[PDB]
Design an enzyme around this catalytic site. Sequence first.
Site, mmCIF file in Angstrom:
data_model
loop_
_atom_site.group_PDB
_atom_site.id
_atom_site.type_symbol
_atom_site.label_atom_id
_atom_site.label_comp_id
_atom_site.label_asym_id
_atom_site.label_seq_id
_atom_site.Cartn_x
_atom_site.Cartn_y
_atom_site.Cartn_z
ATOM 1 N N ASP A 1 43.233 50.956 42.346
ATOM 2 C CA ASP A 1 43.315 49.788 41.473
ATOM 3 C C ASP A 1 42.000 49.018 41.461
ATOM 4 O OD1 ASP A 1 44.803 48.253 39.631
ATOM 5 O OD2 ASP A 1 45.238 46.743 41.164
ATOM 6 N N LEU A 2 40.892 49.748 41.417
ATOM 7 C CA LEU A 2 39.575 49.125 41.396
ATOM 8 C C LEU A 2 39.261 48.525 40.031
ATOM 9 C CD1 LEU A 2 37.295 51.511 43.501
ATOM 10 C CD2 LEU A 2 38.326 49.326 44.151
#
Lengths: 122, 312
Positions: free
Chosen positions: B150-151
């Site tokens: 979830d960067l």
Amino acid sequence: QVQLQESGGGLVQPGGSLRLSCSASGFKFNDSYMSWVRRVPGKGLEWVAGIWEDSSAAHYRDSVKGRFTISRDNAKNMLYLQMSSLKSDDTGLYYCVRRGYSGDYRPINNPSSQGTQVTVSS
Amino acid sequence: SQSDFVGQTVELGELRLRVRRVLAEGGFAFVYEAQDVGSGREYALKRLLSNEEEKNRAIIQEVCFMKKLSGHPNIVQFCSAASIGKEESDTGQAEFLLLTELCKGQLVEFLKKMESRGPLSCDTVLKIFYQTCRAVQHMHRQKPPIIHRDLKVENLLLSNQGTIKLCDFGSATTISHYPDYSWSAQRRALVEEEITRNTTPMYRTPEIIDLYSNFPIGEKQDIWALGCILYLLCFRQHPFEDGAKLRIVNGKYSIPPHDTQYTVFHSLIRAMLQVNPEERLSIAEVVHQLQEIAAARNVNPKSPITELLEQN
Ligand SMILES: COc1cc2ncnc(Nc3ccc(F)c(Cl)c3)c2cc1OCCCN1CCOCC1
């Protein structure tokens, strides 16, 4: 529109004493934690002392304990910092900001005010 | 309810925390600013309220990951955690508390308040991206390797020291997937739905959209996300903003042809946004090349971003 204005700093030889003041406006001073911070050349910004809303709690960093004294006046929205037995490391540009600090004495709110200069040398 | 949590006092270990304000809202948990009454130190407090064991079991592993990622200068510092049963809680829901260190705030909100100054220097982008990758590298060094999945720039924090820190690890995992032809169509569909929940639409990688290409769903997910971020820091806009699956799967994006400010990063962007995860650069290769750029620019990429630090 948080606005602050510090004053009362100057040039004093080691061992001397100063008294910093700060007038605040734009926010509700009575329900906010206030702190004094300083900007030392070469080191950066560091948290010095802080005080709770109703002055029921006062915090100081290790290098100023029993030497500095923080106080406030919610009636006039003022913030005072009584300095004494000043050392060379106390030299810096002092600001007053909202809220406290995190980690190794690192202020939460960066100063938007002009600050007041405190210089300690012979 | 989670709005009446402000102005209350929470006891965690030897700490007595006063809830100052709300930092972020969530459909499951809220993030508050908490201050200690004895030290004056400030913290970030996430408060989860749910009776769903899926979400409850998830935040537990979220804690364990942070405790292991502790000590790193580019990752937010875990402090304490606590479990509260449905009974002791006032909302009639199981309560979980996640306590970290307090930062200046999100990177994004500091960027928009500084767009007035003009375009970002190639140096500042270099500082932000490097410190971001150094955090991801520390994650990929762990045993077993920890994948963020979830960067995004919304998960990038500006520390009080003036450095970049990673924050949310709710979508983090150590599980990799290796789909072959022995996989059923339904298993592919089941795995996809699980991963899709933990990802941002425009950041979703080709290997999780097309599961008939036998692409491994491992640590190379974070590399693709980083390529989206670097593109997002130079051209300010996302390479796959529309989120069209056809564009992501086929890897169809466009770099501004008349760019003359962020030209150095052109090679890194193209090398990180490869459709096949097997062909994408490892995190070590990315960091290594970033260090060469910083050397040629006479810039220390570990140094604090003072221009964003003095932003109010
Ligand atoms: C002082 O600002 C922050 C410090 C923070 N320090 C650490 N973590 C934050 N977020 C966060 C992110 C994910 C998590 F899992 C947890 Cl536990 C916490 C933080 C979020 C912060 O605020 C983010 C949203 C900024 N708000 C936007 C609305 O107006 C006030 C400013």
